Amino acid sequence: FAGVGERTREGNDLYREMIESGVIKLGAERGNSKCTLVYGQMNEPPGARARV
Amino acid sequence: ADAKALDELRKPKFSSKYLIQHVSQKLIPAVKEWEKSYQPPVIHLGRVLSVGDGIARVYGLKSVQAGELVCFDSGVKGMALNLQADHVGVVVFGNDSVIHQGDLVYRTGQIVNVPIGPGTLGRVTDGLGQPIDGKGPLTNVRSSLVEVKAPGIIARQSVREPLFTGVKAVDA
Amino acid sequence: KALDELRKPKFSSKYLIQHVSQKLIPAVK
Amino acid sequence: EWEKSYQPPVIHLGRVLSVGDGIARVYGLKSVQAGELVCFDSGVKGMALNLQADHVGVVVFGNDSVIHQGDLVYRTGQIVNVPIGPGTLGRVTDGLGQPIDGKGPLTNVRSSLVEVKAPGIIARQSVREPLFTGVKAVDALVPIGRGQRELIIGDRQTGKTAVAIDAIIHQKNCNEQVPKAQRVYCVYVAVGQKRSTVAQLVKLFTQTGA
Amino acid sequence: DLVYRTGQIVNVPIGPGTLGRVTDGLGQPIDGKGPLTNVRSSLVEVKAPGIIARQSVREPLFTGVKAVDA
Amino acid sequence: LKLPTAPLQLSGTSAQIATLLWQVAAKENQLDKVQDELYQFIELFKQHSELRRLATDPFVPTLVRTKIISSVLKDSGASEITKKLFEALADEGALSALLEVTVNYEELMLAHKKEVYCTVITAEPLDKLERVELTKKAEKFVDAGFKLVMQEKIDKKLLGGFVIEFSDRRVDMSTAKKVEEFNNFVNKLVLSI
Amino acid sequence: DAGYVSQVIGPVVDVRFDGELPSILSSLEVEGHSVRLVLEVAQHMGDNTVRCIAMDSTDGLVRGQKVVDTGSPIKVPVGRGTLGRIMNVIGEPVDEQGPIDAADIWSIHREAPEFTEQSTEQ
Amino acid sequence: GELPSILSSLEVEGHSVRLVLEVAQHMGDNTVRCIAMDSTDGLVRGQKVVDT
Ligand SMILES: Nc1ncnc2c1ncn2[C@@H]1O[C@H](COP(=O)(O)OP(=O)(O)OP(=O)(O)O)[C@@H](O)[C@H]1O
Ligand SMILES: [Mg+2]
């Protein structure tokens, strides 16, 4: 998932909803995750949103 | 016109000295004839090149940060916005009629900040932090930057609590 | 390092060559 | 015959003043032509597009991240040309004539300039013989002659490419039942398209025979 | 080219010699009837008369058009 | 009003000033008399921080700057062209243009001796008959009677020969490029033949 | 070795180097800054100056601040170590769970896949 | 000698009317930039201007 210049609230919503649904796992079972998040949201300067 | 012979000129190649020993003992008695027209040079302070419409172009101010509060010698504050190579573009927090060419500009050391805390609860304030309600200065308050980065993903949580507005079209 | 301040000139008066030529041709005797 | 008449040519240099956004401002290149191919130190080509009194504005044929300030720019002495000829048939070339289909170098071709002057009044002739597109709306109502410029205009995803590819496929179908003289040889130029779109088109053209 | 100043703000000939004459936008005649004779030069950029210098419009200027003058 | 032609055309607003300076110095036979004055004033800007203050500080008035420059050069043993040039550059605060007027004046002056600076890359250290024959072929890449200021350099990745780098054009008469243009010539005939 | 900040206008920083300019799209680190400020070289200005875009805020930059060249574009961790992690534009973990243990950090800048390696199945 | 303040009024000597200038900007190089209260037709670039 590449969050390019969006709301940080819905990025947190996606992160939480993939913590519960098991797409992202934490701790020792981190390697059984299937999603990499890269986030460049709206509070970032325009250089960080152009390259995320 | 390129920089290589332009750097070769840093090496001396004069081959004669019939002006150098003449004017070097003639320069300092000439400069001292005009020392009341000279303004003192400026490095870490600032000096106004041009002022107009709320913008001061400030010569000097070597160690200012971008977005930093500056203070002119007439008391009115400023904000160093675009730091160009030969001058600093300073926006004026007030009326720029008290700023002249050659006025000293002082760097304050702080990025722009306002008083935050429970002491602001009840006051009528200007856009910079000073109270305008005529009830004295701000007490029980502390200074905080106006350019705080927003809290990220791990700092937030989901919005659950209502905060009703009392307008039933909105709240319905 | 003392001549790094003069490695590129910046001035007003786009017609600078006119004001130099109104001083240099009377330097010819 | 080559060694007995061989002088190595004097190649005029140029120093990159500034580079950015695929534009290289180049000092020097004192005798360069407008629209002439230049060559950089990084092997990337260029074109002297606007010649100014102090520098040359060079458009960069590729990614300008390999060009630095002070890089040497050599002029090639020639206006931009492409290989033309019958060896270009069946070949997927890029915008400069270089092949991108992976089928080796272009055999049986010759170089010719990309910007030739258009033929004048006495060079023309009245457009009388038809060009069949195979689309019966076009062939019936909006007919085409050989030598015509017909704009396929419309919004996105309405079938402009479909009309063009049907014209090319119908020229392949008509090319089997006519003699050598009245055969139509098609060229499809894909300007700014997606690179996976133009692999579907070479798949469809190698599947149909076009 | 040499540019000479005339010593005067931009002026046109005004007076009774202008009546009957076709003129360009600068004051010199184009009808081919020679120069303007009984005339004198005044500025083209005059400040309008003020508030005391005016009075209310009383007299009628008849256009001769029926729809206008009615 | 008749001025002698400069040896080469140049850029704007700091090269045409040097072109005009050369044009009025060649009328008074005074080229090498003002070239060392340009270098001397460069050394003067190197020496004093109060004389390069007139070139960089924008708070000194143009009256004060012109009165320092005029009352410092009270004929100074110097040329009148130099004195009428520097009070002209002091009237605009264009004293920082001196360090490029000197570059373009050096270019005009070494073009005045038809001299040509270049560097030569060879594979081997040269013999003094190999050197004087190299100048017999290098002179035909100059379209005048310019006797060059050729230097030498060695890099044996060349397979013999010479590469003349004239600082604006390169002439690669090396054998290592000849054997590459030989290979590129015979690789294209066998694809057609 | 390093360059210095010449001009800050908004999110665009002009960095001046004395010899050996960085390439376009190269990454530059600013030290002396509070947070890690990464500038990516957008273009060469021409008199030994590069013009950059910043990956964080330019509030705090001083004209003359030391800017060091990385010699490479923005490199980020890639691989199995990034699965289940939140990254920045410059590859930092912002999920507050340790570092990102991924091998073979890659540049974010490469050219497109060329024409022959294009799939046609649907 | 010394520059007027911004909004300070100036008066031009020797004009056909009373030409009052009002200083709007300091442009640097000891130069102010003014806004004339009457017409400027007839102004020469050497005219004495008195700071009020
Ligand atoms: N005659 C037709 N019959 C059925 N389908 C068609 C016809 N012409 C076009 N289409 C369909 O319409 C779609 C768009 O066609 P086409 O790509 O030719 O239009 P376009 O204007 O070139 O689109 P774009 O602007 O996106 O390139 C295609 O997916 C194609 O399958
Ligand atoms: Mg299409």
Task: Please tell me which residue of chain B has the smallest CA distance to C1.
Answer: B10
Task: Measure CA H3 to chain center.
Answer: 11
CA-to-CA distance for H48 and H37, rounded, in angstroms?
Answer: 17
* Element of type H or E holding B59: strand B55-60
Residue of H41, H43, H44, H45 to mutate, testing the E interface (most E Cβ within 10 Å of its Cβ):
H41
**Residue type (1 letter), G40:** E
DSSP B64: P
| Contact criterion met (CB below 8 Å) for D67 and D40 | yes
- Strands B88-93 and B77-83 come out as antiparallel
Ligand 1 centroid to residue D144 C-alpha, Å: 21
The single residue listed with the structure tokens 């992160």 is A15
Q: Which residues contact D76 (CB under 8 A, 6 or more apart)?
A: D36, D37, D38, D39
Residue type, B64: V
Protein residues with CB under 6 Å of any ligand 1 atom: D 156-162
Cα–Cα dist G1/G33, whole Å = 19
Name the token pair of C20.
């130099």
Name the amino acid, one letter, at G60: G
Which position has the token pair 């009256």?
F63
**Which residue's entry shows tokens 């003020």?**
E50
Task: Enumerate residues 6+ apart whose C-beta is below 8 A from B148.
Answer: none
Which of B5, B10, B30 is closest, CB to CB, to F68? B30
**Beta strand ranges found along chain F (DSSP E):** 119-122, 151-154, 162-165, 169-172
Residue B62 maps to which CATH number? 2.40.30.20
Ligand 1 atom at shortest distance from the alpha carbon of D154: 21
Sheet (strand G86-87) strand order: A2-4, A37-40, G86-87
Q: Helix B20-31 to helix F31-47 angle, to the nearest 10 degrees?
A: 50
Closest C-alpha to B44, from B106, B117, B125: B106
Helices (H), chain B: 3-8, 20-31, 168-171
- Angle subtended at Cα G107 by Cα G106 and Cα G110, rounded to the nearest 5 degrees: 120
How is residue F190 annotated by DSSP?
A: H
Q: Which residues of E touch H42 (CB under 8 A)?
A: 9
Range of the domain at B60: 28-110
Q: Do F167 and F135 meet the contact criterion of CB atoms below 8 Å apart? A: no
Subunit contact G11:A30, Cβ cutoff 8 A: no
Report DSSP state, residue D69: T
Is A51 annotated as a binding-site member?
no
The candidate with the shortest Cα–Cα distance to D12, out of D39, D35, D45, D34, is D39
| C–B contact: 3+ Cβ pairs < 8 A | yes
Place of tokens 């600032």: B46
| β-sheet bridge partners, residue E12 | E42
CB pairs under 8 A between E and H: 5
Q: Using alpha carbons, select from H12, H36, H37, H38 the residue that is nearest to residue E47.
A: H38
Q: CA D107, CA D122: separation in Å to the nearest integer?
A: 34
C22 Cα–ligand 1 center, Å: 71
Query: What resolution in angstroms, rounded to 1 decimal?
Result: 3.1
Which residues of E fall within a CB distance of 8 Å from H41?
9, 45
Residue whose Cα lies nearest atom 23 of ligand 1: it is D157
CA F119 vs. chain centroid, Å, equals 15
How far, rounded to the nearest angstrom, does the alpha carbon of residue D146 sit from its chain's CA centroid?
A: 21
For chain F, the structural domain boundaries read 1-112, 113-193
D54–F contact, CB cutoff 8 A: yes
List chains touching F (3+ CB pairs under 8 A).
B, C, D, H
Minimal-distance CA residue of chain B relative to G9:
B82
Distance between CA atoms of residues D19 and D29, nearest Å: 16
C-alpha span between G109 and G70 (Å, rounded): 14
Residue numbers in G near D68 (CB within 8 A) = 21, 23, 44
Q: B148 in contact with A at a CB cutoff of 8 Å?
A: no
Question: Which domains does chain H carry?
Answer: 1-52 (2.40.10.170)
C-alpha C21, offset from chain centre: 10
Quick check: F159 and F174 in contact, CB under 8 A?
Answer: yes
Is A10 flagged in the annotation as binding?
A: yes
- Tokens 């002057």 correspond to D117
Ligand 1 atom 5: the closest Cα is on which residue? D159
| Solved using | cryo-EM
Gyration radius of chain E's alpha carbons:
18
Instruction: Judge whether A17 is annotated as a binding position.
Output: no
What is the C-alpha separation between D27 and F110, in angstroms, rounded? 20
Nearest ligand to the C-alpha of residue D137?
A: 1
Strand ranges, E, within E1-68: 11-14, 40-43
Q: Which residues contact A36 (CB under 8 A, 6 or more apart)?
A: A1, G82, G83, G84, G85, G87
Q: Which of F169, F160, F164, F137 is nearest to F150 (CA)?
A: F164
Q: Token digits for C13?
A: 């008066």
CA distance C23 to chain B (A): 21
Let me know: does D112 contact D84? Beta carbons within 8 Å.
yes
Chains that touch H (3 or more CB pairs under 8 A): B, E, F
Residue G46's nearest CA partner among D54, B122, B167, F187 is D54
Are B107 and B44 in contact, with CB atoms under 8 Å apart? yes
CB F27 within 8 A of CB F49: no
